[PDB]
Design a protein around this nucleic acid. Sequence first.
RNA 1: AGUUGAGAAGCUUGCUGGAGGUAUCAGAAGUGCGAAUGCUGACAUGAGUAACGACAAUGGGUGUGAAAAACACCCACGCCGAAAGACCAAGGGUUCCUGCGCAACGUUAAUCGACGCAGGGUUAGUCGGUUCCUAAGGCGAGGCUGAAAAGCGUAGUCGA
RNA 2: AACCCACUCCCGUUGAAAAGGUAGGGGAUGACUUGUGGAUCGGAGUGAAAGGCUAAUCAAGCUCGGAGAUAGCUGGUUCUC
RNA 3: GAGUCGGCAAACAGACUUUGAUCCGGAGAUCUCUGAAUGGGGGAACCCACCUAGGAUAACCUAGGUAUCUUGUACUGAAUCCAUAGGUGCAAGAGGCGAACCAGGGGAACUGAAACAUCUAAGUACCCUGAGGAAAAGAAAUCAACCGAGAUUCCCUUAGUAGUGGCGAGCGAACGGGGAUUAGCCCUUAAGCUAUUUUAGCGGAACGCUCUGGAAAGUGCGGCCAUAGUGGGUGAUAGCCCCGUACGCGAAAGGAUCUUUGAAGUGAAAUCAAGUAGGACGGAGCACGAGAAACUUUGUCUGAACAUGGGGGGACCAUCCUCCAAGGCUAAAUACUACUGACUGACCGAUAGUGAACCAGUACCGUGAGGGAAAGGCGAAAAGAACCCCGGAGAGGGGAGUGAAAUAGACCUGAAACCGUAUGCGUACAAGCAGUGGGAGCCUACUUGUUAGGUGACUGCGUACCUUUUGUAU
Lengths: 103, 44
Amino acid sequence: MQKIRRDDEVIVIAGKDKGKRGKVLKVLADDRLVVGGVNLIKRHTKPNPMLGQQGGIVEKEAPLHVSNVAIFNTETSKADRVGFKVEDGKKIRVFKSTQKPVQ
Amino acid sequence: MKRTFQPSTLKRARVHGFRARMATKNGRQVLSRRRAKGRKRLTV
RNA sequence: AGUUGAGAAGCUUGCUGGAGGUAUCAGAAGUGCGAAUGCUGACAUGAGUAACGACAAUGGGUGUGAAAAACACCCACGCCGAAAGACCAAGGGUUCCUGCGCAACGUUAAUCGACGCAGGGUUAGUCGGUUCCUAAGGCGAGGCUGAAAAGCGUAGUCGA
RNA sequence: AACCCACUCCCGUUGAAAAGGUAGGGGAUGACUUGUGGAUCGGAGUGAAAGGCUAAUCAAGCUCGGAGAUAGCUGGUUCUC
RNA sequence: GAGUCGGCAAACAGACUUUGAUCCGGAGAUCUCUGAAUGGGGGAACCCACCUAGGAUAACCUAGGUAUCUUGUACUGAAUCCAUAGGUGCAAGAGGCGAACCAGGGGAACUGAAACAUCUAAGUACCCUGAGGAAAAGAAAUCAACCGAGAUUCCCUUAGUAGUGGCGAGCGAACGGGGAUUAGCCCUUAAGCUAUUUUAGCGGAACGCUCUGGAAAGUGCGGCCAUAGUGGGUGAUAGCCCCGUACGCGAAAGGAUCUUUGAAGUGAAAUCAAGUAGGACGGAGCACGAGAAACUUUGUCUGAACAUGGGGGGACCAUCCUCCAAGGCUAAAUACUACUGACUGACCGAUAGUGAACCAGUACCGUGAGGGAAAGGCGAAAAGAACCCCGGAGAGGGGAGUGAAAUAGACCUGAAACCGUAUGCGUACAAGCAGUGGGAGCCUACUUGUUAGGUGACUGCGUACCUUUUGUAU
């Protein structure tokens, strides 16, 4: 239904920061994913108007494409493709290397 | 001097209005032709 | 920039450029522009030249402002006064009023504006409409006339 | 005199204006001028008749089709040996 | 099946998680005023109403109804005794729109003929009226020659042939062959019958290290998938990272198509033919322009035999052959695309391709019908420039920071004409298509001068290019 949900833990392949173990926070609708901890950006922002402040340089994460991260296995501890080969009451996300269901 | 256009709203609607064009048979063909080109107005 | 061929043209490199290119030999052609008072965008010469829209005149002061011949107030001059004043009908469509502004517009400058952004603002038994009745004229059930469209017209119902 | 009209001179002609202006002129109780609303249309209307006017167009409008009309006539026709 | 509140685009406020929240498909409910517009009128998006049954307070609100014409059907009843016209009440149907296709009604001109009246163009453009998903046409009073063929419609030949034609320009058959398709029946009127696919989805195989780089799909080095290897897109070139690609399951519920099936029409399903055939003037259609002109048509005027008859076989006549006219019904092969959906390209790549990649039939130009443009691109990602200094508290710059790169800064590349700023050499006593042949000097480079480049005092010859023409600096 989708390989990657909100509450996962992934690793990054083919980017600025490959091999960074991460964890998904927000999934956008244009196959772009905000991974918590990686792909840091810095925005020169004006100090906020109407009784606000921002000051200067504040970090946040910029999203990256869904074809870059993959579901992390923790039994070979490397990236693994996932699949839906088990369907008996529901499509269960299952690794294709070991045929074991993800949690 | 006197230019060839003196405006009025009562003479404009009785000659070029919708209920004037829709009354005759030529005018109902003026409506369908001007509609199917796709104009925004049809009643100038 | 160099260099090679009778020529159309080919080849190797310096910098800019930032992802596509086509030995060779065959095919398929929207296949090669200087000129058609050719077509559509750009930029020149004329040239910082003519003009700046009635020959009803303005001169000081004080103010604001980054900056006053033109903005506001003051004092004094001029001009229309069967209009250059007031008001209804058309027509227009927010140009009216107040804060904020001055890049563009206004034949110059602008702090000013019929110019931008944001708010505001039209109160009816009697005034005009609608409602009632008709003129010219229009449309016209039934009805006559006409290849077909349609034409004319009685009752009627619209039209200041 | 308002008002309608256009006889003369000069200025203007890239005009302030695709027909005006400043001075002077003619009619000014009627074959008058004019506001609103209607009627007549393309080999067809209207016309105190000039071939005049019918949306700055008229010896027969404007627009879309026949239609890429027809032109023994003008103009142009693009790389080498 | 875990995120969501449409697009051009921010901060508020909140709804549900594991299922019905977004989101996609079927069915229903609401559906303001205009418009065939239909209760009567109107300047389209407005005004004035009635009637009935109910509710509501000197002011209303619900709920329906209320157009003309056809057909039928009741009731009603004029001059007129009867009884038709006429008038009401009810039922059923139609009206309008749409690109092309089809059949009918009406039907030009320019132009060809090197002029032009016959003729062509052409029964074409256009204008009306009908109907259908196709229509029309069709089951022998047909063609052939003494042999025979048996409905129509469409393509290929006969053949640009016989003919026709101011015998000019031109227009042009049939007979016979080859194919596509393969049914024939009869009374609106003697006496009629006229079982699969489709709109939503779901599963869907196979990769690892190593270099350079901002970033690997690329360099290397190996392995695997395959009924799916030339797809799209991911920070650069990916069968194995992501979405997809070959087969099956379907589907509460509708739709359509073949069936049973229901009624009725689709309609399997009986004869026959009077102002009819023919005739006489006047026209059309036949390839056929009064031509020896057969045949079909119908505006005017006429008129038969009874299938022992009849009419055809290109003037006409005898002999032979072959068919039953004056009543009807019919599938298939066929024509078309405003609308869809897949796919495909020796098609376009923003002056091309739709007029229109962009908020285009818009802006604008017209009293109107009508005409009708110009307008794409920052980066992989907004990381879209905090902070400082000059300035009007601005505009614009100078830094600084982001980034692989700001001469990528609100924009890829970035040419020519046009305008400048620096550096070198020549020009203030010299006459002209502004170049060419010789040539002094100076400059900057290289070995330092033919090693090369740039200027060109002086001087000899020299009247641009194209088109028309007997000739052009003209």
